[PDB]
Amino acid sequence: IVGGYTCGANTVPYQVSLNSGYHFCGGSLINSQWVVSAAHCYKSGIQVRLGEDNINVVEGNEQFISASKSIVHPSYNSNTLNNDIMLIKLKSAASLNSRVASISLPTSCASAGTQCLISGWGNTKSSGTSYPDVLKCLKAPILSDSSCKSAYPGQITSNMFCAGYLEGGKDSCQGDSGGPVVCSGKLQGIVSWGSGCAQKNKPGVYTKVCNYVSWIKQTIASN
Ligand SMILES: NCCc1c[nH]c2ccc(Cl)cc12
Numbered sequence: 037i038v039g040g041y042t043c044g045a046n047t048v049p050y051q052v053s054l055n056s057g058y059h060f061c062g063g064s065l066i067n068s069q070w071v072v073s074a075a076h077c078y079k080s081g082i083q084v085r086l087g088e089d090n091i092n093v094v095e096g097n098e099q100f101i102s103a104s105k106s107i108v109h110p111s112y113n114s115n116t117l118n119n120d121i122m123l124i125k126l127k128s129a130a131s132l133n134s135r136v137a138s139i140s141l142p143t144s145c146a147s148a149g150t151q152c153l154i155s156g157w158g159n160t161k162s163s164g165t166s167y168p169d170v171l172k173c174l175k176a177p178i179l180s181d182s183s184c185k186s187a188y189p190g191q192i193t194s195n196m197f198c199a200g201y202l203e204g205g206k207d208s209c210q211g212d213s214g215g216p217v218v219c220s221g222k223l224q225g226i227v228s229w230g231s232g233c234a235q236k237n238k239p240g241v242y243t244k245v246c247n248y249v250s251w252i253k254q255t256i257a258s259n
């Protein structure tokens with residue numbers, strides 16, 4: 037997250053870290069046994085880390101649980117990033133409490149102008165590199181479809197939306213991939229792609245979760 041603030045320990049209780057010997061992607065806990073992330077985060081050998089703030093220190097509220105199955109969306113296209121969404125099943129159910137909690141799926145799509153919260157452990161610089169150990173947060177609005185399409189001509193499908201600031205300076209970044217965009221208490225987006233971080237006229241692009249609720253629900257019911 038570039039231009040954000042320190043969330044505070046366990047104030048984003050649905051935020052997960054995906055770990056393969058090191059943090060490599062974010063994700064969101066949607067019930068006691070399932071995580072949603074970005075399809076471009078796929079790899080084998082994933083451990084899901086819940087209840088994290090400092091990802092390099094054991095602070096006492098962590099739960100570490102291995103993934104038993106991963107399911108990339110059937111129409112994911114890695115060249116265009118269309119349908120950038122994946123489900124991860126935990127080998128055992130997480131123990132839910134005030135610091136580890138699921139986030140609700142949406143019943144309707146959010147409109148442009150809605151304020152959202154984006155979080156992750158990604159890079160905090162737009163030029164250069166500095167990775168934080170504690171979770172960073174950013175409040176940002178959903179942008180209109182016309183502004184999003186004008187910023188990324190020919191690249192925005194109906195499964196994407198833009199959120200952020202056309203002036204630049206605030207954005208998600210490398211290592212925030214897969215993380216949540218939460219608006220009005222519902223999961224509306226997944227950190228997906230962009231052109232750099234926090235550049236002028238190049239806001240972040242996010243997977244439009246409301247388009248996938250039926251697929252998520254059916255998949256969880258049969259796996
Ligand atoms: N708005 C963040 C978009 C994003 C997702 N994965 C990334 C990897 C590298 C860089 Cl420079 C940016 C990204």
Ligand SMILES: [Ca+2]
Nearest residue numbers: 090093094095
């Ligand atoms: Ca920790």
